[PDB]
């Protein structure tokens, strides 16, 4: 008979004494607000700024005994967001917001429905730019753990407690992909209960493990680093005497190893510790220059050393030549097997 | 006699029991809202961010039996956007908004008119920055399909259903051009009906097929890649003996093929898979270096090998020379015919 | 006696039946709104985005017979923008807004005055980022025509018509200069009457012809392109025999012509058609490389060809030398006279 | 007894006939509003956009005889910004705003106090991004004059006149420094009275003279330009015969003079006229290349010219050598003394 | 019995004469507002703009005798931010805001509670982009002191005084790290009492000492500067005669020392004074070029100077050779010990 919006105006109005400024179960046990999120979008994970943009559906559920109706014949009463400032809502916020906003296009993207016993479902759409610190000690082979944490601002622990629901506390959209990362499915859920000089305030947090796409940096960097070192060694398969081709093929490995070192730290923050993209690349710099010294070991013999005199001349340089030819794959592949299985277990 | 705005205030006011918080056909069949868009602007299609900005006219049509007037002698009653928060409107939103806004310059750019039988036309101007994932496996020769999807936020499927109208569900402005793409005319129109733990919500979506302008990358990249490979082969039409001109014309092809590899991946995301602009260009790198080995095959003879001794010296190198001269167009044009007709059928 | 604001409250209030939701001359002839703009600022003309920012004073004039007073002894009644939502105003908008805003610093920058016969002057300050497509077939020598168009949003042609006034429909500020362009004084004024499936809507538009400053690109690009070609020819005034100076002065023209080709397409969109800054510059690339082939024509004689044998050696190369010396200004100045007078008539 | 806010509500309310929509001295002499600013922050002076951000305290003073109280025992009544829309205020705006905003953090940063005779002090905090054209004919040695101008928007000259007060019309904060400029203390104060087709409107303006920091560009550019020219001359102190060291030290001056010409016009607008950073640098380009021709004048003798024949060979080249050695400081220091004292008097 | 929000409406309403426009202790002693902040986020410390973004909790405490309740049985009455414009609050602002905003997601992030004796606690969440001047005379080894200062805007010193509380006037979040800096724990707290021509206004300020991470610039710059100088000296361990290897290893040190000088001043402002990253690097430029002159001192002997003639030829050059070999670590390590212990005490 009577429509729900007319029914609900006398359920929360000045009649029946409902005050939206007062929490449920006032002067009693605290309010148990259970939460779960639905990640629509994810990404633009900046590393200069060390933050990431997410677009979620924040669903909040609690019980309000003041809103419990008994005689109206429906099981749920929805409430459009025009009258949304008229009941009590929890003062949730994010402890690492770094700017956020609602979505208000064609309607405020907000949802509210009330069960018969007073169970309240509240769902809004938020875009967050959440801050997470980035550990980059092993940069292309790292697992970034960026978190988000949900706190009360005004109510202390003895008035309002946040929880995650057991039925899927973080849902992720179906085809949610990232251009540079993989979002793992194990999502840690734990408390971050804050203590200030004002009081103690509730917190729950979710932890997202992000693992990179190694395939990009392997193409741009690790393959043009690997081939120049092989270019460095075919350069020694030049003739035995000091040819000017060793001058050009020497700087050929120099002009590439500096160019690959030019755009190497392109989009990276200025961290003090050393990462892993350069301890690969600094080794690729000294294996360039070890071929530049290898021409000097030709010129070490060529200006130092007639049937007797010329025989020691070639015999000493070949004694360096076949040793230097074998030892360059020796010093490389021992390093190259020490490099990857280090990061395979880290 | 009586003006429409005075007539409409008693048609939707507190008299006659109209409540804007309640959908039409309440406790009955769901509301059938039919939609079509008019794309004014399009583009700024970012690929680092994988989104695109669009500027549309969102037209929504439904029937409200509460608004059906009978005695007023006009066929349509317009309603200025000052009184627009006074009737019911659908809570449409975009599932991939990534930020959006209205246009409010000199007047809120909004339109509302009401037919005699209660048919309501509602038209607004929106600017969207819609997210679309970018498949870039064959980057200059790809067909990007970027979509837009229109959902209800608060009403489930048993209360509100979106549809596309048959009479031109997507209109495009007349001279709408893109700097980098071609918008095809076949626009797929289908449903994306969402299931959450809240309920099931209606969705309709439109699919835009975008095909690139290959003419830009052919000028900056494919022509300076093609000529250096031809520069690499006239470099072998140098004299037969080991001249220093082969040192300079060797690095001449090196200084260009790295410079063309420098600004190659300029404005591109860091995708893990390999695209097609570099498997053209990596082949253009090894055909540079195959001429650098071709001087080494001159120096392979020059320091290894008197009427008998000099005759085998020139005869072996010419046996390599005329083979290497013919085989370089052989290995190129077989690749070059394998490259394009692969992407002609993809 | 009675102040104007007290007089005007009974002229447009609930007394005397004035309704701001209803256009003048309702159920009669359409409203003739005449417009003119005053461009304060102009520029930041982007070409990657193909838009430009303008800052105007939009003056609108129409007649409202409901506002015609007769007994008050003043000729014009101004109205401060606090009461500006109380009379009727046209719903003008720009069909290519791409974002715009008002100016509200220290007061809403808005102006309204009402004549005795009901003539209404309405003037506001708007900042627009107007979209214009950029034709760049001849890029440093182009004339860009970027437009702006003013439409009604809610009223059709039978209710509201926009016009330009004859008395200076576009005024420009006094010292309005642009860093890269010249705004011509001939400004085309014409109609762009839109037909949608909703109805037909009025439009008037203004066309601004923008002509570039050729002096910038002549300094950075055309002078360092011209001198290297002259550097390419003094390089042939080296000694007759194959000297190593031709190796260095060969790549001297190469290291500049690629560097000038590096920052050439610096701030340009990725258009598919070829512009004019590169068909100058591609010709400046092959006149670099024609001197690199000119050393090969020295080495074509030096390894192919004793009083008889040496006389044909110098006689053939000088036969190429004096021909190549004259023909390089021949092939250049014919092109250079064909280049500019092409664009002098376009 | 009675508090000021209760006293002031009957001083400006509906009682006593005060109307905030009506200027003081209505139908009388115009309102004399005197102004002065306090510059808190200054800078981020962009040159691509040709604007600058400033953060001021705009103090406005006028007399309102309607607000003159006589019996309340205090000399000044302050007014908090909640009731600030209740009295008359001038409609000041900036004719070159290019976007501006108020500051509203923890309170609207606004100030109002009223003297006994009706003198009103009004002070607000504004952040402006003011447009100024940039003359850059002598770019590191220029004096930029960027202005700001304060106008009425709705009141003509016969109703409202702006003035600067004699007691320090522009105050500057104490430690206000700029990273690239020096703000001179002579600040010109004059009128810019505007004439439109609407009427004539008041304007006062202030002129700020900005002089650059020459010390930055002297370090990055003028010292690495000076030393390469000295590197160009010690390069001639090589041995007399045509050595290959002149090839390397020739391009040594080329690889630097183009690199210093690469990042020279880094953050500069595309002005058509020639500035002064390049007419220094273009001269530094041809003094590089004059040493490249100086090796050609060695090779002019080396392939043109036995006790008689060799004596003219060395005697002609030394006749060029000692002349070219002295003349290079001759042509440089005459230019270098002509360069700076030109800009010392401009 | 009676709820607090109903109790508080009669405590601050129109009954009991409370006026939020009037400060506590009016016409009496000034208001003593004590402050402390809690820094949540810190950083994005720009140096081109010379500012930094901070995210704080601003806690303000004062006493209001008008709000002192006696009969209600609770010790603290909280107040939700809906009724927050209903009591008096101090008009705090930041004298170097450069733009700031509140946080309003899911609730206005604001907190208010009132003790029994009228002590008021007020806590809000602010994001500031605070301006600080950057002294960069010794750039990688500097200690930046960036401040923040809290002032009243409308109340003078005889009405409102700010103080820092003794109990931890600046708290910092637990794991607050910076990518480039270290926030020291000694935080200076002092007054910055402002004198304008309006009056004198209260100020308190906090000073944050920021010390850089030297480890980043030591890896990218100081190690590739150190090794090239050692590369410059092994280059002299080439053979004694003038070899072409000294040409290539000469420019090898040139191509790196300019490349390291290319991206050196990458993200730096254009300060006029000289910093310390280049007086390290300019010395690393002339120790590159001192090896280029060292080949000229070989060619000084090679073209100037038969059993007697050749003995003085080698004896003079070895007299330069062993002196130049020892003196290069002599001139370097004296500088290198003078460089660091200068900045160790500064
Ligand atoms: C919100 O959730 C919390 C946590 O589940 C609830 O707190 C817990 O409530 C139970 C039942 O009210 C308490 O058990 C009782 O404890 C007292 C004292 O030990 C004992 O005398 C009773 O026999 C009974 O065992 C429990 O102590 C309490 N725990 C805490 C930490 O507060 C809370 O009641 C929930 N509130 C609502 C409104 O649902
Ligand atoms: C909005 O559009 C939907 C889809 O066209 C309408 O739903 C359909 O409405 C028709 C007629 O009301 C239903 O047909 C009837 O079905 C019942 C049960 O099968 C049968 O007893 C009747 O004889 C008749 O055939 C149809 O089932 C129904 N389909 C669905 C999926 O709901 C809806 O009525 C429209 N609402 C409005 C307000 O226009
Ligand atoms: C706004 O401007 C338009 C265009 O000037 C006006 O429309 C024109 O108005 C005139 C006079 O009212 C019309 O002339 C009349 O035409 C009828 C039918 O042909 C004829 O019987 C009369 O003897 C007279 O010639 C003219 O047709 C009409 N044109 C159009 C295209 O509408 C309009 O009246 C102006 N409205 C106002 C409020 O000023
Ligand atoms: C605001 O400031 C302006 C400029 O100081 C004032 O205008 C000037 O006011 C004086 C005195 O009212 C005028 O002098 C009188 O001029 C008339 C006509 O010439 C003469 O008959 C009188 O004997 C006396 O000399 C003066 O002309 C006038 N000048 C202008 C350009 O308007 C104005 O009165 C000030 N208004 C207020 C409210 O303070
Ligand atoms: C806010 O804090 C300030 C600073 O602590 C207080 O000002 C100081 O208040 C004391 C006590 O009211 C004053 O001491 C008195 O001074 C007078 C004159 O010298 C003397 O006759 C009395 O015997 C007594 O010693 C003190 O002068 C005053 N100082 C200043 C600089 O104002 C203020 O009272 C505090 N206000 C509130 C509301 O708490």
DSSP letter (8 states) at residue B87: S
Give the integer Cα–Cα distance in Å for C50 and C134. 6
- Provide the H-helix boundaries in chain B: 4-12, 214-217, 223-234, 245-262, 276-302, 309-344
Closest-approaching ligand to the CA atom of D65 = 4
Residue nearest to atom 29 of ligand 4 (CA): D29
Give the integer Cα–Cα distance in Å for B85 and B81. Answer: 8
Counting beta carbons within 10 angstroms of the beta carbon of residue B273, is it exposed (0 to 12), middle (13 to 18) or buried (19 or more)? exposed
Rounded CA separation D57/D125 (Å):
5
By CB atoms closer than 10 A (0-12, 13-18, 19+), residue A136 is buried
Residue B305 labelled as part of a binding site: no
Length of chain E measured in residues: 346
Distance CA D56, CA D50 (A): 19
C-beta of residue D95 within 8 angstroms of C-beta of residue D27:
no
Which residues does a 6 A CB cutoff place in the pocket of ligand 3? C 25, 29-30, 32
Beta strand spans in chain D (E): 31-46, 51-63, 76-78, 92-94, 100-102, 110-115, 119-131, 143-152, 160-164, 170-172, 181-183, 188-191, 194-195, 200-201, 203-212
Per DSSP, the three-state class of E19 is coil
CB contact under 8 A, D106 and E97: no
- Is residue E133 within 8 Å of E86, Cβ to Cβ? no
SS3 category, D27? coil
B189 Cα: distance to centroid of ligand 3 (angstroms) = 45
Query: Taking the CA of residue D32 as centre, how many other CA atoms within 13 Å lie in the half-sphere pointing to its CB?
Result: 7
Structure obtained using? cryo-EM
C179 within 8 A of D50, measured Cβ to Cβ: yes
Q: Does C58 contact B106 at a Cβ distance shorter than 8 Å?
A: yes
Sort strands B170-172 and B31-46 into parallel, antiparallel or unpaired. Answer: parallel
State how far the Cα of A31 lies from the Cα of A44, in Å rounded to an integer: 36
Cα separations in angstroms, B155 against A110, A124, B200 = 11, 14, 9
Task: Spell out a b/e string for E36-47, using b for 16 or more CB atoms within 10 Å of the CB, else e.
Answer: bbbbbbbbbbeb
CA B2 to chain A, closest CA, distance in angstroms equals: 30
Pair of tokens at residue C18: 């004035």
Which chain A residues are within 8 Å of B296, Cβ to Cβ? 234, 237-238, 245
Pair E249, E256: CB distance under 8 Å: no
End-to-end CA distance of chain C: 67
Measured distance CA(B76)–CA(C257) in Å, rounded: 68
Residue in the structure block whose two tokens are 């070059």? B336
Give how far Cα B326 sits from Cα of B313, B322, E205, E234, Å. 21, 6, 80, 45
Residue whose C-alpha is closest to residue B136's, from B283, B284, B330, B268: B268
Cβ contacts (< 8 Å) between E135 and chain D: which residues?
none
What is the number of helices (H) and of strands (E) in chain D? 6, 15
CA of A94 to the centre of ligand 1 (A): 27
Number of Cβ within 10 Å of residue E262's Cβ equals 13
Which of A97, A247, A300 is most worth mutating to test chain E (most E CB atoms within 10 A of its CB)? Answer: A97
Q: CA-nearest residue of chain E to A152?
A: E109
A26 contacts on E by Cβ (under 8 Å): 3
Ligand showing the shortest atom-to-Cα distance for residue C28: 3
Structure token pair of residue D76: 């000044």
Q: Which of E153, E250, E272 sits opposite D248 (nearest CB)?
A: E250
3-state secondary structure of E17: helix
Let me know if B166 is exposed, middle or buried by CB neighbors in 10 A (0-12, 13-18, 19+).
exposed
Task: For chains A and B, count residue pairs whose Cβ atoms are closer than 8 Å.
Answer: 126
Ligand 4 pocket residue status of D32, Cβ below 6 Å: yes
Tell me the pairing of strands E143-152 and E203-212. Answer: antiparallel
Given a contact as 3+ CB pairs under 8 Å, which chains touch D? Answer: C, E
**Cα–Cα distance measured from residue E274 to residue E283, given in angstroms and rounded to the nearest whole number:** 14
> How far does the CA of residue C226 sit from the closest CA of chain B (Å)?
21
Q: Which of C100, C196, C299 is closest, CB to CB, to B105? A: C100
* CA separation for the pair E69, E76 (Å, rounded): 10
Query: What is the number of residues in chain A?
Result: 346
CB atoms inside a 10 Å sphere around CB D337: 10
In angstroms, the CA E271 to CA E142 distance is: 15
**Does residue E299 contact residue D239 with C-beta atoms inside 8 Å?**
yes
Q: State the distance from the centre of ligand 5 to the C-alpha of D241, rounded, in angstroms.
A: 93
Closest-approaching ligand to the CA atom of D26: 4
Token code pair at residue A218? 């392997």
Among candidates E20, E92, E296 on the partner chain, residue whose Cβ is nearest the Cβ of D238: E296
Q: How far is the CA of E25 from the centre of ligand 5 (A)?
A: 13
- Specify binding-site residues of A for glycine: 59, 123, 198
- Pick from E55, E168, E179: which is nearest to A98 by CB? E55
b/e per residue, E152-167, with b = 16+ CB within 10 A? bbbbbbebbbbbbeee
Count the alpha carbons within 13 Å of D226 in the hemisphere toward its beta carbon: 10
Strands B160-164 and B119-131: unpaired
In sequence order, what are the residues at sequence separation of 6 or more whose Cβ sits closer than 8 angstroms to the Cβ of residue A345?
none
For B263, the closest chain A residue by CA position comes to A263
Judged by CB atoms closer than 8 Å, whether chains meet at B92 and A80 is answered as no
Nearest Cα to D150, choosing from D68, D90, D95?
Answer: D95
**Angle at C303 (CA atoms; ends C297, C309), nearest 5 degrees:** 105
Chain-chain contact of A153 with E107 (C-beta, under 8 angstroms): yes
Beta carbon of D65 within 6 Å of any ligand 4 atom: no
CA distances from B115 to B70, B88, B122, B160 (A): 10, 15, 12, 21
Question: How many CB atoms are closer than 10 A to CB A6?
Answer: 14
How, if at all, do strands B188-191 and B160-164 pair?
A: unpaired
Chain E residue numbers with beta carbons less than 8 Å from the beta carbon of A292 are 249, 252
Residue A83: its chain B contacts at CB < 8 A?
Answer: 21
Backbone angle region of E110, left / alpha / beta, with phi > 0 → left and psi within -120 to 50 → alpha: beta
- How many A from CA of D193 to the centre of ligand 4? 19
Q: Is D201 annotated in some ligand binding site?
A: yes
**Cβ pairs B/C, distance under 8 A:** 126
CB pair distance less than 8 Å for E247 and D245: yes
For residue E301 the two structure tokens come to 């002997």
Please give the Cα distance from A287 to A335 (Å, whole number).
12
Please report, to the nearest 10 degrees, the dihedral formed by the alpha carbons of residues B177, B182, B186, B189 taken in order.
-80
Q: Which residues line the pocket of ligand 2, CB cutoff 6 A?
A: B 25, 29-30, 32
The set of chains that have 3 or more CB pairs under 8 A with A is: B, E
List beta partners, residue D101: D127
What is the position in ligand 4's atom list of the atom closest to the CA of D24? 38
Residue ranges per domain, chain B?
Answer: 1-213, 214-346
| CB-CB neighbours of E219 under 10 Å | 19
Cα nearest neighbour of A83 on chain B: B21
Token duo for residue D315: 């005697």
Question: Who contacts C125 (Cβ-Cβ below 8 Å, separation ≥6)?
Answer: C40, C55, C56, C57, C58, C102, C103, C109, C110, D93, D153
Strands in A67-187 per DSSP E: 76-78, 92-94, 100-102, 110-115, 119-131, 143-152, 160-164, 170-172, 181-183
- The residue whose C-alpha atom lies closest to atom 7 belonging to ligand 2 is B29
Query: For residues E170 and E206, is the Cβ–Cβ distance under 8 A?
Result: yes
Q: Is there a contact between D111 and D121 (Cβ–Cβ < 8 Å)?
A: yes
CA distances from A136 to A142, A143, A183, E179, E222 (A): 7, 9, 17, 11, 21
Q: Which two tokens stand for residue E258?
A: 């300019």
What is the Cα–Cα distance from A270 to A263, expressed in whole angstroms? 15
D119 Cβ closer than 6 Å to some ligand 4 atom: no
Using CB atoms, pick whichever of D80, D107, D167 lies closest to residue E93: D107
Residue partners of E309: CB distance under 8 A and separation at least 6: none
DSSP one-letter string for C8-33: HHHHHSTGGG--TTS-TTTTSSPEEE
> Cα angle at D284 between D283 and D289, to 5 degrees?
95
Q: Based on the number of CB atoms within 10 Å of its own CB, is A65 exposed (0-12), middle (13-18) or buried (19 or more)?
A: exposed
Of D126, D198, D300, the CB nearest to C105: D126
Chains D and A touch (3+ CB pairs under 8 A): no
Interatomic CA distance for residues D90 and E183, integer angstroms: 47
What would the two tokens of residue A145 be?
């753990």
For E274, list phi and psi in degrees, rounded to 5: -90, 135
The reply to whether ligand 1 has any atom less than 6 angstroms from the CB of A25 is yes
Helices (H), chain C: 4-12, 214-217, 223-234, 245-262, 276-302, 309-344
Q: Residue E84: name the closest of E114, E62, E43, E47 by CA.
A: E114
Among D24, D32, D65, D166, residue to substitute to test ligand 4 (most atoms within 8 Å of Cβ): D32
Q: E2-6: long-range contacts (C-beta < 8 A, 24 or more apart)? A: E3/A19, E3/A22, E3/A26, E4/A22, E4/E72, E4/E74, E4/E77, E4/E78, E5/A19, E5/A21, E5/A22, E5/E80, E5/E83, E6/A19
d(CA D107, CA B21): 35
Chain C residues closer than 8 Å to D276 by CB: none
Query: What was the resolution (in A) of this experimentally determined structure?
Result: 3.1
Q: Ligand 4: which residue has its CA nearest to atom 8?
A: D29
> Which token pair is E136?
């960069």
Q: Give chain A positions within 8 Å (CB) of B153.
A: 107, 109-111, 125
Atom 5, ligand 4: residue with shortest CA distance = D32
Find tokens 């060797």 and name the residue. B250
C-alpha distance from residue B22 to each of B32, B78, B159, B203, D64 (Å): 15, 21, 11, 21, 52
Rounded CA-CA distance E60/E162 in Å is 9
């Amino acid at each position: 008979p009577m429509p729900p919006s007319e029914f609900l105006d006398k359920l929360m109005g000045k009649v029946s004494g409902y005050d939206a400024r007062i929490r449920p179960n006032f002067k009693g046990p605290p309010v148990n607000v259970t939460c779960n999120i639905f990640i629509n979008s994810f990404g633009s994970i900046a590393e200069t700024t060390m933050d990431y943009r997410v677009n979620i559906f924040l669903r909040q559920q609690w019980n309000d005994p003041r809103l419990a109706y008994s005689e109206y014949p429906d099981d749920s009463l929805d409430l459009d967001p025009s009258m949304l400032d008229s009941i009590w809502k929890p003062d949730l916020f994010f402890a690492n917001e770094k700017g956020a906003n609602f979505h208000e296009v064609t309607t405020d993207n907000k949802l509210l429905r009330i069960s018969k016993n007073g169970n309240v479902l509240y769902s809004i759409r938020i875009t967050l730019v959440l801050a997470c610190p980035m550990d980059l000690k092993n940069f292309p082979m790292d697992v970034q753990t960026c978190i988000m944490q949900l706190e009360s601002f005004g109510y202390t622990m003895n008035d309002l407690i946040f929880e995650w629901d057991e039925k899927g506390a973080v849902q992720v959209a179906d085809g949610l992909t990232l251009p540079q990362f993989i979002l793992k499915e194990e999502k840690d859920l734990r408390y971050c209960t804050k203590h200030y000089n004002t009081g103690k305030f509730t917190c729950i947090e979710a932890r997202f493990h992000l693992e990179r796409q190694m395939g990009y940096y392997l193409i741009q960097m690790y393959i043009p680093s690997l081939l120049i070192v092989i270019l460095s060694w075919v350069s020694f398969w030049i003739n035995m005497d000091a040819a000017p081709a060793r001058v050009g093929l020497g700087i050929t490995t120099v002009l590439t190893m500096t160019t690959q070192s030019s755009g190497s730290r392109a989009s990276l923050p200025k961290v003090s510790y050393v990462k892993a993209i350069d301890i690969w690349m600094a080794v690729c710099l000294l294996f360039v220059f070890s071929a530049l010294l290898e021409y000097a070991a030709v010129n070490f013999i060529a200006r130092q050393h007639v049937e007797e005199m010329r025989k020691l001349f070639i015999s000493r340089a070949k004694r360096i030549d076949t040793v230097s030819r074998v030892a360059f794959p020796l010093v490389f592949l021992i390093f190259n097997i020490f490099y990857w299985i280090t990061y395979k277990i880290i």
